[PDB]
Amino acid sequence: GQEREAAEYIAQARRQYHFESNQRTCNMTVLSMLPTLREALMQQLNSESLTALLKNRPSNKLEIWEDLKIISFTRSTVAVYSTCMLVVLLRVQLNIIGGYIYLDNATTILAPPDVQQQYLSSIQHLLGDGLTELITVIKQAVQKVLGSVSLKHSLSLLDLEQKLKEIRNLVEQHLLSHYMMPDEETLSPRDITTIKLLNETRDMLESPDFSTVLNTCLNRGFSRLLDNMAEFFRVSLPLAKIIPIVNGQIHSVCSETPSHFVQDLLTMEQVKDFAANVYEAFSTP
């Protein structure tokens, strides 16, 4: 009757206030971490140093340019992957822990402040060892796709999309969850609970629903990479002219600013639906 309907209404309403609050937190955490992701990519894929050498009358000028060919494409390709992973991994973690935090409002507390801290600190991996492994793999893939391609080779916008698809296919069949968490290995009483949480996160990253939502974001991130570059094709350009167009994409793919790619992921209703389902699974007794 109406009593049951009121009961389900209040439960949903309660779940929804905490979920929404938790999305606001997650949105903040994503945007505060972006400059660190951006800094790590620039340091590990430093185009601007190679450029500096070229603007300084060097020998092996073509070795530097071939290096730039790889670094530029690698950096923009990795910028898209890591940004999408950043957003979706934080949605997972914050709604997994949010779920537990929601339930502890009912003797034994499952997720106290120290478990929350040690669990959330696992984001480390994506910005750390995971990112470097990701760079190594994308760099190899770019090296296979663009290695034998001349700097004079003129590429149309369609050719460039096709190179990007080839890079993607080498990467995504080399899952992507290996880059977001450290491997599980073959204790302290709240380290037990932390291990249970990291395992549940790993399982989630291997779920079809998670893989679906990450694929959506990736698709939209690479279309955007291409839309951004379309403005420079007004026709085909020499690959050497494409390098600096591609090289500069990191600044927009990893911008905190509104209307940029990260904010479109944060306001993308498909990722919210996925996050809401995570929170619900982990907040129900």
Partner: peptide, 17 residues
């Protein structure tokens, strides 16, 4: 001794601007 390449590389170096 590749003029066309040297032109191409000089002008593309300005495109990082």
């Amino acid at each position: 001794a590749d003029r066309e390449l040297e032109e191409l590389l000089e002008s593309a170096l300005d495109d990082f601007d």
